[PDB]
Chains A and B, each alone.
Chain A
């Protein structure tokens, strides 16, 4: 047992192993210890994959890097490409033209919506929704619930819900349950009534059909999804109105706007209402676990400047909050060697001195797969990992030595803090949060005949429910922002500016003989940075610190826990052998393990 960050860690209880953690991207192992009453008192995050992209990049052309690092992840597809071209542009002092800026912003906001909505329905929902309970639902009462949860959603008839229920019935009655096989159906951890389950399963299927439409925005500007193309100096999708011969003409821009308008309807009518409704019902059940580090320490680099290269205009303004003090946002500088640092004390890597954290411009990725003396099992057959030693392929990022949570929740807490200090660029997220708190506390309870509650945002946001809510609100805000970006792009083109690439420094003969750069992105899961050193036209060092690296990190030199481990602490389990609560909270971070390890 030891105390850290206000958590009393104790490994004396019953050990539970979850390997694999499913409904994530990539490979994770989780172990917990539970006390005599099935309460988690210790949690261990193990990243169970590594590929070594940082090693592979050495000696290659900086102009090619975006395509290599894009393949860190096909779920957060393109955010690494964006970080990479930003890092190279930063190193070489390249300013991209306005149309390239706006097209990159539209592609980024398209990824946010697609990634968030697919996460919630296809990965997260089965932690809240019992599909077998959906089979017991009354189609008429499901119709009535749908009209209360989202009056504007046109797909609400008893007949519609009956037809979906009948397809689920036929599927289950076949005895081939496929993705539902060996599920935790009927666990007391599930609290939704049958009608809410059937509504959610219906929206799971709606989202699966619609998500493929949203990414056609990537296909227009970037050729394909997954893995759209980027370019150092701008975008490849040259503009010609008068013209079908150019990648981008008015017909292609009209097509993009049609896709954006569909996204805005989905976020407003399906996704946000479902998360408000499910959040309200789990709040009513008292399930406010999973706050972890969100109650104290949150970080984001800040993103979406409404004026390009002007960080004061970030529409998701960033920084760092410590100790739950929302009255003080510290500025975060990705260039400062004393701010972002990575430890490998408890990671399968080696440094000269593992008592220190390296800033990514000085970063080192040398693998060291070695298990501690207290391991149960062998090097190739682990029964119980030894978290006192090296236990993960994830490095341990810290900010000025502090363990931070990153992600949509971090950005929404930071936006709220900024708005309260008088930042007008954060007005929309503040409005969404106050609207959401009123719906969860008052409006939805009144509509469902449940008691009204008086939770503050300070109380509601640092929770697994709050983390899930912030992701849905961020999806909505990103759809609204890209709608504005589309108008600005078309207006700029119509005013006569058709430029899409700055090629002044394309040829490496023009480059300084050495340079360093950093590119940051508010990626779907939180704060992304790429740090590059260039020498004689080649990559000298390339280090990535990725959002799930922050959240999924193992303990640092001081033994401080990361966001995943903190979030699981002090959570009761209905059945320690069914990881329902573990999955619900881990999934609320939207873990991307290929991202975390790269």
Chain B
């Protein structure tokens, strides 16, 4: 039985999603790459460069027409005639549209591909545009976060490969199995929130007791992700456990919702 080809494209990005992917403990990225998918194109890891790299896309798209996964990290810019992101001397958007046309499914990795992330923050000099605003005729699963949790990324792959199906999505196209809960729902500091027990200044007595970070700007109450329960790096910690409020990094437009340190209104 063939392993499903994955063509992993990179637009404008910081490569945090590729890095998060290889942090996965369950499953190991090694086991995903050797035993689950065929990772046939990926600028980060692939042996081939230049003409030899670009030749892979046509080969896979022909042999596995309508039976490969397009994974997108980053996004296309619409300013500078698209040449603020150049691949093979051409705008990235041309590569994205080409590979998208015969994909069985499209994964938008991270906030860049999902929504725009930091390059799309005001005033968006490159007109960086999320994948679903460019590719409008293909099924897209959004996996937002800057980056998403490693096990959320490999969990999406594992589901799609086991079932040959996209998992159930919410209205924003995020998998319900990972994005159904707000951080604030199961945040271990919630009993402090409920008792009005808050940090007011960094390293105050309240901070040393792990009091709620709401008044330090925590956006956990408006942010959907698995960070409070699944946590990060094989369940070692998350932003709040290590003492910083959630900055809302899985939510659309989180860079332009005011200072990270300004509290939410109407507690």
A residues with a Cβ closer than 8 A to B are: 17-27, 29, 46, 48-53, 55-56, 61, 63-64, 67-68, 71-75, 77, 118, 122-123, 126, 131, 167, 171, 174, 176, 178-185, 205, 208-209, 211-212, 215-216, 218-229, 231, 233-240, 245-247, 348, 367, 369, 377, 379-383, 385, 393, 498-501, 503, 506, 577-579, 583, 594
Q: Taking the nearest CB of chain B, how far is it from the CB of A598, in angstroms?
A: 10
Contact in complex: B244, A22 (CB < 8 Å): no
CB pair B201 A506 closer than 8 Å: yes
A18, B243: Cα distance in complex, Å: 45
Interface string of B62-88 (1 = CB under 8 A from A): 000000000000000001111111111
Q: What is the distance, in angstroms, from A238's C-beta to the closest C-beta of chain B?
A: 4
Q: Please tell me if the beta carbons of B203 and A500 are within 8 angstroms of each other in the complex.
A: yes
A51 touches B261 (CB 8 A): no
Query: B39-47, B134-142, B157-165, B168-176: which one contacts chain A?
Result: B39-47
Contacting pair A583 B259 (CB below 8 A): no
User: A229–B242 contact, CB under 8 A?
Assistant: yes
CA distance A61 to B52 in the complex (A): 46
Q: Contact at B119–A56, with CB atoms within 8 Å?
A: yes
B80 proximity list for chain A (CB < 8 A)? 50, 348, 367, 369
Query: For residue B45, which residues in chain A have a CB less than 8 angstroms away from its CB?
Result: 23, 122-123, 179
Q: Give B118's nearest chain A residue, CB to CB.
A: A71
Are the CB atoms of B209 and A220 closer together than 8 Å?
A: no
The smallest beta-carbon distance between B201 and chain A, in angstroms, is 5
Q: Tell me whether B233 and A55 are in contact (CB under 8 A).
A: no
Q: How far is the CA of A380 from the CA of B94 in the complex (A)?
A: 10
A20-B87, A25-B44, A71-B146 as given contacts; A223 in contact with B232, CB under 8 Å: yes
Given contacts A22-B53, A56-B122, A179-B39, whether A205 and B30 have CB atoms under 8 Å apart is yes
A250 to B: closest C-beta gap in Å:
14
Q: Do B49 and A18 have beta carbons less than 8 Å apart?
A: yes
Complex partner residue of B86 from A22, A27, A126, CB under 8 angstroms: A27
**Is the pair A178, B33 in contact by a Cβ cutoff of 8 Å?**
yes
- Say if the beta carbon of B48 comes within 8 Å of chain A: yes
Q: In the complex, which residues of chain A have a beta carbon less than 8 angstroms from the beta carbon of B126?
A: 50-52
B11-28 residues with Cβ-Cβ distance < 8 A to A are 12-20, 22-25, 28
CB atoms of B232 and A224 under 8 A apart: yes
Asked if B147 CB lies within 8 Å of chain A CBs, one says yes
Are B236 and A220 in contact (CB-based, < 8 A)?
yes
In the complex, the 10 A-B pairs of residues with the closest C-beta atoms, listed nearest first:
A74-B16, A52-B125, A183-B47, A382-B89, A236-B243, A223-B242, A501-B202, A48-B86, A229-B244, A51-B119
Which chain A residues lie closer than 8 Å to B22 at the CB level?
A: 118, 122, 208, 211-212
| Residues of chain A contacted by B86 (CB below 8 angstroms) | 19, 27, 29, 46, 48-49, 382
CA distance A516 to B96 in the complex (A): 42
Report A223 CB to chain B, min CB distance, Å: 4
> Contact check: which of B56, B87, B233, B255 meets A212 at CB < 8 Å?
B233
Taking a contact as CB atoms closer than 8 A, the residue among B3, B23, B239, B260 that contacts A174 in the complex is B3
Contact with A along B233-250 (1 / 0, CB 8 A): 110111111111001010
In contact, B210 and A64 (Cβ under 8 angstroms): no
Tell me, yes or no, whether B123 is within 8 Å of chain A by CB.
yes
Is B220 part of the binding interface, using a Cβ–Cβ cutoff of 8 Å? no
B42 touches A26 (CB 8 A): no
Q: How far apart sit A236 and B244, CA to CA, in the bound complex (Å)?
A: 6
